[PDB]
Design a protein around this nucleic acid. Sequence first.
RNA 1: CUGAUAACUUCACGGCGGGCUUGAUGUCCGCGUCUACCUGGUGAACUGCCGAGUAGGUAG
Length: 106
Amino acid sequence: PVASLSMQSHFHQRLQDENRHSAITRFSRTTNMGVTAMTCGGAFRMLKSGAKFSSPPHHRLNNGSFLVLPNIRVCGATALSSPVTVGIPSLTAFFGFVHAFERNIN
RNA sequence: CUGAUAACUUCACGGCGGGCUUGAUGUCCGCGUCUACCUGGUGAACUGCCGAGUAGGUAG
């Protein structure tokens, strides 16, 4: 996977109004990454939820082969997953976790 | 088979000095709670003697 400066400009420009979703990520240092980084040197704003966690109900009620795994705690994960969003990780990370688990246990 | 594998940010740090919130103030008038009403001991711990003795000891 690689990055598109065109998608970076699309996801860049609109959020200047909405600073509630601003996540300033200054990069390598603006010498050799490219002039598209020199254009917005310092800001590099990206997408985040704009609100913290909350309190849900897990369930209101009370195939098969349901294998139950509680209380997985992940410290030091990856939040900058896409080039443009900042928040929860990828779903291909969870897919790779599950596929590595079955390729162990088979 | 996880934008793959690896990845010690840290050391020091005196927000202090001063300060009159007060003046005045009629809440009141009126007011019928009433009618009715079975808690029961089945028969169920007796008859005597001594003690001057509502106290006190006896025999069965």
